[PDB]
Design an enzyme around this catalytic site. Structure first.
Site, PDB file in Angstrom:
ATOM      1  N   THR A 142       0.862  -1.212   0.000  1.00 19.74           N
ATOM      2  CA  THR A 142       0.000   0.000   0.000  1.00 19.74           C
ATOM      3  C   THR A 142       0.880   1.237   0.000  1.00 19.74           C
ATOM      4  OG1 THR A 142      -1.697  -1.100   1.371  1.00 19.74           O
ATOM      5  CG2 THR A 142      -1.782   1.287   1.212  1.00 19.74           C
ATOM      6  N   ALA A 164      -8.074  -2.806   5.860  1.00 21.25           N
ATOM      7  CA  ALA A 164      -9.004  -2.615   4.751  1.00 21.25           C
ATOM      8  C   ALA A 164     -10.418  -2.272   5.216  1.00 21.25           C
ATOM      9  CB  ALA A 164      -9.040  -3.861   3.893  1.00 21.25           C
TER      10      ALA A 164
END
Lengths: 198, 196, 233, 204, 222, 212, 222, 196, 198
Positions: free
Chosen positions: F1, F49
């Site tokens: 990420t 998430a």
């Protein structure tokens, strides 16, 4: 840990507090103010666990301010630090304790004397001429044991405190990104934005 | 250790040693591991100490509060109040417990509530660290319905070996006969069971 | 959490043209010790269902109670309590599975494997598993413990697919299930030699066979085995 | 941490009508950090090819161990070693170290200069052998390859079509593997002539 | 892994599937658990792949060296004494369980050695992931004295019970029949019950689909 | 990420990748790492998430109640506070999430507040959170200037995420861009990292050690 | 130590077509190395033209679905039998899942159907509520073997226009439900070849503006 | 499991089941747990498998090399070669092993080498997971010196219960009689010992 | 960890290596040279575990030098790094392995080309245009991916390398006390004592 220094002189208290903020590998900021004014003549620096740190500071600040408009009178350094040690004291024996260490330095307009209280997350409070939290003490305490005098001028204190920082830089592994200084006295709080602008 | 209760002609007899160890030290060598929760209802404690002791204390309590309003309770009943406690609490209890009682109608029956509160009604049962040795005898030397004596010399020979090979168990034998006659206490000293 | 103490082993079962079968010996182990025999693991419910239970016995004894009370309760203010509105296998099982799950979800399970066999009121066959985790599944054949490893295989050489039940004679079904029970006893230190087989035919009803045993064995060929490679005598 | 996934990488081999193909990615990295995109996993001794995956330091050592070994062979028998005679070797070799294995997954592939028949083979760290007439895969994206090969493979492809099938398998698994990529290279081996090619792929 | 062995009148037979695992993924779709120790002595290897194929290797080679020197056909208990003596030395760190079978000038033999060096004997044995499957197909359909064809039919019908009901075994069946006064017969694929149906589309790409950056012709010799 | 955001004359620039990974396999290259709290606020997604997605969407509802009551736009500071407060309540329970709340109100101008599950709440000008944060910080630190054009401010954010994408194995896919203004945010598309690389290498010269 | 979780293998798949959507999932159900049933569905119609499947730990799956379906029921009860917009559905599933954020449902769930414009639509879920609108998603035991394939085929990845070098990407056109199911079938067979937790059968539910259709195809019982 | 050897009139008889478990699975159900290291010297294996097996293999070896030069060895001798191995290696061996042999002079004797290589000579011994149950019988039903039959119906009833309550032990009984006559093999199928 | 950078340009290699040395809480030195010249045109920087670090460096240096007088010929960068990877390779599987990472940058007077090899303690070697060990890469690799060109002058490389350090300072938690730079080329090794004297 973070850097938290403080020293009481002739008629005022001085607080030093590193500016960096680090999350793991990176440094998200190099201009953080670990201070938080509780009242016109009481100032409190802090350093500890990530979240716990300022949630607590603000909480304390809110209580003092509340008390101050209510009474319309200003709570004294001595009584302010007493309140703090009370909370932290209850904190240590609770589902989850705040891990915060602090320094409170105010001016007692009643005695016309500056006072500096150092408190650790366990509820351990003590009144000192100068103090520091965490590893910050080992590198400085000797220099201050050496030069400190109660008659010192605000002007002299800074010069002293400068030395301590220079030492912190030369032998400390962490790069704390400098400090921010602040002075408390009969006229209130002001920021020595010239230890940074130097 | 060594406990058991056997059903026969009249009703039933339950007996068990006296030895209670704490490590390899013998805390008490003359224990009364045969608790009575009611006139015709008795039981022999096994497993932990303090636990079993308090269970009985309670089981008794209920029964004493039962008769007091629903007349004298059966034997199947008592063994229920026993498991209820041993089941719901299988987590903080270590109980061996064997329950035995003589009812006028049903003669005399025997139920064994082991670790887990799993209840079982058998001709006779044997629990206690020492039972592991008298599985040979006990089974191979058991005829259905014996006499008041024809059997007392069974409990005596079972409890004989139990002591002979299981350190954690010994002392003096102790029998209690539940019958139409009533409660009778027996005690058969060392120089005796060893003799055999 | 917890641990099971006293324990029942396998419970094998299968379907046929008119119904289903379900067997399970009567031994209730206490570790390596075989401290019990008069143990019944086939709990019929009503006149159309049977529930074979495996695992902790104290918890099996608990369910049974629940089942009885489920029965003594369906009657309460219901006149068709033996006809139109009377417990089906699918009702029982649905209820059971609920509880089972509800339980693991409270981290305090019932250490059991379960089979609910029977025939719906409209005649259909019903066979469905359900263990202490709530996991359930249907199939022609079912088994707990070793059954899943040793029974199943055989009971599949018979009904290999959903397209063989129709052509499986109530007699052939059983003759297998019992040879299976021979196998179970042949290789499974936690099994008993005598059992209890119960059938549930849509025509004949419920047949609850009890105490039988495994005959027709082969131990003769033992005399021939001597030592382990070198010994000649 | 599995020693066989610090560095990453993949290798795949296939057989066709009178030829073989061997391909691999190019990345060598430490954990997440990508370090190089010129790290080749396929070497060759004479007309025999060997691709190796796993712990990079071992991949390198093995190449040197086999070069060394094959040169001594040639000199002594006055001929280059064959594909099978070689497989047997790297197998024993891997095994002599059964209790402190090299952390790899080799894959031999060549053509036999006598018979003229195509050859491809795989091994696991302790040396268990494995021939197959269709394909061999090994590496981090090991599964993604079995999925691609068990679809795109076709017996007896022409060298020109084999190149397309093998490339596509490699190309696409390396895209679903986080530790494989940064380029690729594919070889098409015939009795004679060997063509080498680098492919264009995402650089992420 | 799913192997068995059963002896009859004039010999013995062993069978094994052909599917190597490695986690849930399949590696070899057509392996070969059947190894040769010596002409009329064969092994079936379950468990750790490399280990069994490397140990039989060894022992075989040595026995070949043995007979030659002693000028007599290889006995089967030798091959056994060797294996389990070696297996033991390594306190089970060489996970190779197997079924050794054969015939020497003293009859037909069948054994089963576990990893740690323990060995047992019987008339029929099963070792592997689906040993309990193919051991319900042996504790049911077994009888003393069985025709060659019966023995073969049983052994291969055990393996099959492994293939279908076990996940750690599948694909084809492999067989080897050792008969007295006769050579041995190796049946690589006495069965092929599994054969992937044909695909639904041809997945060949048109030449030039893949993008190339460089090309060249590398050399080989000197 | 690899997610990032920063302040400048034009307002705020937000950029993210889209790779999500399970162990060593790329379970997905199509993740919306930007939670559109509401027309005026955006939150990024690092750490967890779901935790990010769930609470930030929750936060949006909160802002809506607040605006109906006061008949006025909620301030970035008050919004960021609300979030961190709810987060702090669960300190210990195991939440997980590093995030940038980005807004631009009338009174406070353009403001970025970093907020995470530890209870930290920082005000700032440049923030990068992720496994590629270190690489993004590179391109960014050297080129940032308060007086960046809008066109270039977006290109900077793009080239930054790209740098990560290339080196960090756990980052890649397609970059997503947003620009936040005093009237709300504007989406600036989804660019595939695959294609963008070749483009930049070719038009910028950079990425020499890459043959292609 | 009581461990409340278990993995019952399985694999499911969901593709979103131009104006229809599919969701397939094999029927095999396992425990460790054994079989529990060769036919046990994991793909259900939940009403209002919405297919759903939760794959992972059998029980949590059944629970979620039941819990979701009882929820569609009440959505009608409170808003005048109004239809549940698949988007509105996913948002709802989130809350269900996140409901147990600290004792998570050990499953990867997937719904699929049609949006409010008639276009196909899929939705993949975190095991704790993280959802995204996907257009093609394999989830389950062998998802890592089918995603690389669809990538290539359904999305034409790493494919270029011949004779233009790496300059023109091959354009994507959209597959007829017919072609998609041929794709879906090949993917599952391959998977069965190389993964021991996949096999037995493949059930497929197709969503179109007429309702839900179901098709089945037998897989190998390895 | 269940093994033992008993001394009597002529010499001695050693027997033991056939069951050998691996978990709750039965790896072999017809095992020959009665290894012979020499003509009049036999032993019954207990404990681990692979270990005991190899010990015997060795113990045999020595004896075979003994007679070959020092004449046929006693029985006390064999039990020495056995402990020597079981002692020096008490760290990587799990052996139950019971040794029995018939010597012309000394009649027939019995020594039991347990975990630790602690050697003991007794009238008879019983080892194996199942021996824990036949401590009642065995002891209470044992008369010194029996007959060739008067005893075979002992081993039979001991080994009866052993199987009856100890899962890890069962199969078919197996006896070997060491006598002046020589070696004799017996085998008494299931439908039999259960019958009792 | 310590800082180890290196970059190859037009006709030379440059090596950067932090100067500090830290034992736990304090900094015993801020002028340490992590370099060690193997021969007139081969230089090797290192960083790793406390003791292992220079015992190994010197050992390698001793072997090369021995070889050089013996043959009277100078071993090449390529062959020198090969030898190193061999040792470290054997090291990893020994009672106790050296935990040392390295950079070798020499000038191949035979090809008249500068070459830089980066090797980690596992025996993993690779030839690169620029490299770094440990965490040092994440803060720099992107800047170099951006500006590096093979045609660069020695003069240009330094300017580049300066940027990487400035970044290391701004975002790295540790205070590495600056770096020491060194250049290798056709004329040998020299020290840029003006990146320090700046």
């Amino acid at each position: 840990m973070d850097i938290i220094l403080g020293i009481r002189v002739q008629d005022s208290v001085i607080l030093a507090s590193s500016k960096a903020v680090t999350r793991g590998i990176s440094v998200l900021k190099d201009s953080d103010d670990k201070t938080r004014q509780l009242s016109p003549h009481t100032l409190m620096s802090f350093a500890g666990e990530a979240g716990d740190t300022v949630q607590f500071a603000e909480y304390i600040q809110a209580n003092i301010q509340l008390y101050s408009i209510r009474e319309d009178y200003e709570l004294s350094p001595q009584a302010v630090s007493s309140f703090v040690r009370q909370e932290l004291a209850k904190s240590i024996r609770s589902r989850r304790p705040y891990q915060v260490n602090v320094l409170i330095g105010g001016y007692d307009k009643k005695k016309n004397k500056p006072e500096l209280y150092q408190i650790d997350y366990l509820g351990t409070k003590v009144e000192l001429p100068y103090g520091a939290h965490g590893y910050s003490g080992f590198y400085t305490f000797s220099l201050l044991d050496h030069h400190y005098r109660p008659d010192m001028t605000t002007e002299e204190g800074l010069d002293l405190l400068k030395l301590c920082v220079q030492e912190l830089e030369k032998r400390m592994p962490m790069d704390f990104k400098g400090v921010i200084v602040k002075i408390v006295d009969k006229d209130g709080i002001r920021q020595v934005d010239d230890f940074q602008a130097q | 250790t060594s406990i058991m209760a056997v059903t026969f002609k009249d009703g039933v007899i339950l007996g068990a040693d006296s030895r209670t160890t704490t490590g390899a030290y013998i805390a008490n060598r003359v224990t009364d591991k045969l608790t009575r929760v009611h006139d015709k209802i008795w039981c022999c404690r096994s497993g932990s100490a303090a636990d079993t002791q308090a269970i009985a204390d309670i089981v008794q309590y209920h029964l004493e509060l039962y008769t007091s309003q629903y007349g004298t309770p059966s034997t199947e009943t008592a063994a229920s109040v026993f498991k209820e406690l041993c089941y719901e609490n299988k987590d903080n209890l270590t109980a061996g417990i064997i329950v035995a009682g003589y009812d006028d109608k049903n003669k005399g029956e025997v139920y064994t509530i082991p670790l887990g509160g799993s209840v079982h009604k058998l001709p006779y049962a044997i629990a206690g660290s020492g039972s592991t040795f008298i599985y040979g005898y006990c089974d191979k030397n058991f005829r259905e319905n014996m006499s008041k004596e024809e059997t007392v010399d069974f409990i005596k020979h079972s409890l004989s070996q139990a002591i002979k090979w299981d350190g954690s168990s010994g002392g003096v034998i102790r029998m209690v006969v539940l019958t139409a006659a009533g409660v009778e206490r027996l005690i058969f000293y060392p120089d005796e069971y060893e003799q055999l | 959490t917890q641990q099971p103490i006293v324990t029942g082993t396998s419970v094998i079962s299968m379907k046929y043209d008119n119904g289903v079968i379900i067997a399970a010996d009567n031994l209730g182990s206490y570790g390596s010790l075989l401290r019990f025999n008069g143990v019944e693991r086939l709990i019929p419910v009503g006149d159309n269902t049977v529930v074979g239970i495996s695992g902790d016995i104290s918890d099996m004894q608990h369910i049974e109670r629940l089942l009885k009370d489920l029965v003594t309760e369906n009657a309460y203010d219901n006149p068709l309590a033996d006809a139109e509105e009377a417990l089906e296998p699918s009702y029982i099982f649905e209820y059971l599975a609920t509880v089972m799950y509800q339980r693991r979800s409270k981290m305090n399970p019932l250490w059991n494997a379960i089979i609910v066999a029977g025939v719906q009121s409209n005649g259909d066959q019903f066979l469905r598993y359900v263990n202490l985790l709530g996991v359930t599944y249907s199939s022609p054949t079912l088994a707990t413990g070793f059954g899943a490893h040793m029974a199943n295989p055989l009971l599949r050489k018979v009904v290999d697919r959903e397209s063989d039940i129709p052509k499986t004679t109530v007699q052939v079904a059983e003759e297998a299930i019992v040879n299976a029970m021979r196998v179970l006893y042949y290789r499974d230190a936690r099994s008993s030699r005598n059992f209890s087989l119960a059938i549930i035919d849509k025509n004949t009803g419920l047949t609850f066979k009890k105490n039988l045993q495994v005959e027709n064995m082969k131990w003769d060929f033992a005399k021939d085995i001597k030592g382990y490679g070198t010994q000649k005598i | 941490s599995d020693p066989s996934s610090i560095n990453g990488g993949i290798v795949v081999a296939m057989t066709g009508k009178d030829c073989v193909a061997i391909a691999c990615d190019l990345r060598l990295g430490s954990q997440s950090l990508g370090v190089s995109n010129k790290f080749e996993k396929i070497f060759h001794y004479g007309h025999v090819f060997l691709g190796i995956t796993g712990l990079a330091t071992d991949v390198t050592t093995l190449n040197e161990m086999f070069r060394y070994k094959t040169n001594l062979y040639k000199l002594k028998e006055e001929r280059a070693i064959e594909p099978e005679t070689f497989t047997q070797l790297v197998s024993s070799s891997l095994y002599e170290r059964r209790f402190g294995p090299y952390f790899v997954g080799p894959v031999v592939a060549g053509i036999n200069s006598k018979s003229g028949k195509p050859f491809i083979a795989g091994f696991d760290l302790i040396g268990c052998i494995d021939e197959a007439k269709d394909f061999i895969v090994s590496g981090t994206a090991s599964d993604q390859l079995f999925g691609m090969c068990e679809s795109l493979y076709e017996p007896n492809l022409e060298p020109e079509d084999l190149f397309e099938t093998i490339s596509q398998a490699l190309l696409n698994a390396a895209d679903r593997d986080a530790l494989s990529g940064w380029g690729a290279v594919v070889y098409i081996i015939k009795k004679d002539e060997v063509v080498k090619r680098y492919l264009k792929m995402r650089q992420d | 892994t799913t192997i068995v062995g059963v002896k009859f009148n004039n010999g013995v037979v062993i069978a094994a599937d052909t599917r190597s695992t490695q986690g849930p993924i399949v590696a070899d779709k057509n392996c070969a658990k059947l190894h040769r120790i010596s002409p009329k002595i064969w092994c079936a290897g379950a468990g750790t792949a490399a280990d069994t194929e490397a140990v039989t290797q060894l022992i075989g080679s040595n026995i070949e060296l043995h007979s030659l020197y002693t000028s007599r056909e290889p006995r089967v208990v030798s091959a056994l004494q060797m294996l389990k003596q070696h297996l033991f030395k390594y306190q089970g760190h060489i996970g190779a369980y197997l079924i050794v079978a054969g015939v020497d000038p003293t009859g037909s033999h069948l054994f089963s050695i576990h990893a740690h060096g323990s060995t047992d004997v019987g008339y029929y044995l099963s070792l592997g992931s689906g040993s309990l499957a193919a051991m319900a197909v042996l504790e049911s359909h077994w009888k003393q004295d069985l025709t060659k064809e019966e023995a073969i039919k049983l052994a291969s019908d055990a393996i099959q019970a492994g293939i279908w009901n076990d996940l750690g075994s599948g694909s084809n069946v492999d067989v080897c029949v050792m008969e007295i006064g006769k050579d041995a017969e190796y049946l690589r694929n006495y069965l092929t019950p599994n054969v992937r149906e044909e695909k639904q589309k041809s997945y060949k790409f048109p030449r030039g689909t893949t993008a190339v950056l460089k090309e060249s012709i590398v050399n080989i010799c000197d | 990420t690899t997610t990032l955001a920063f302040r400048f004359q034009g307002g705020i620039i937000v950029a993210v990748d889209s790779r999500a990974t399970a162990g060593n396999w790329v379970a997905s290259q199509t993740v919306k790492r930007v939670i559109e709290i509401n027309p005026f606020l955006l939150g990024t997604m690092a750490g967890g998430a779901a935790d990010c997605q769930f609470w930030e969407t929750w936060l949006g509802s909160q802002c809506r109640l607040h605006e109906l009551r006061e008949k006025e736009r909620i301030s970035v500071a008050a919004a960021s506070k609300i979030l961190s407060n709810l987060v702090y309540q669960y300190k210990g329970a195991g939440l997980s999430m590093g995030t940038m709340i980005c807004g631009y109100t009338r009174k406070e101008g353009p403001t970025i507040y970093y907020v995470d599950s530890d209870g930290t709440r920082l005000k700032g000008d440049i923030f990068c959170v992720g496994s590629g944060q270190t690489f993004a910080y590179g391109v960014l630190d050297s080129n940032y200037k308060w007086d960046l054009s809008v066109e270039d401010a977006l290109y900077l954010g793009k080239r930054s995420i790209l740098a990560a994408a290339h080196r960090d194995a756990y980052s890649g896919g397609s970059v997503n861009l947003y620009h936040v203004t005093e009237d709300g945010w504007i989406y600036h598309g989804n660019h595939d990292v695959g294609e963008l690389f070749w483009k930049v290498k070719e038009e910028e010269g950079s990425f020499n050690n890459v043959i292609g | 130590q009581f461990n409340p979780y278990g993995d019952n293998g399985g694999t499911i798949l969901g593709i979103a077509g131009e104006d229809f959507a599919v969701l397939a999932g094999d029927t095999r159900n396992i425990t460790d190395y054994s079989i529990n049933s060769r036919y046990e569905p994991k793909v259900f119609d939940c009403g209002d033209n919405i297919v759903m499947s939760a794959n992972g730990f059998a029980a949590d799956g059944d629970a979620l679905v039941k819990r979701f379906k009882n929820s569609v029921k009440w959505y009608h009860f409170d808003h005048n039998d109004k239809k549940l917009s698949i988007n509105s559905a996913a948002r709802n599933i989130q809350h269900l899942l996140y409901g147990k954020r600290f004792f998570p449902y050990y499953v990867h769930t997937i719904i699929a159907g049609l949006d409010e414009d008639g276009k196909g639509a899929v939705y993949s879920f975190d095991p704790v509520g993280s959802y995204e609108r996907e257009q093609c998603r394999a989830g389950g035991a062998a998802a890592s073997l089918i995603m690389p394939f669809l990538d290539n085929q359904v999305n034409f990845k790493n494919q270029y226009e011949p004779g233009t070098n790496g300059k023109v990407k091959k354009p994507l056109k959209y597959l007829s439900v017919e072609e998609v199911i041929k794709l879906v079938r090949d993917s599952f067979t391959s998977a069965t070849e190389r993964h021991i937790q996949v096999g037995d059968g493949l059930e497929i539910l197709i969503v179109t503006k007429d309702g839900v259709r179901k098709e089945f195809y037998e897989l190998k019982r390895d």
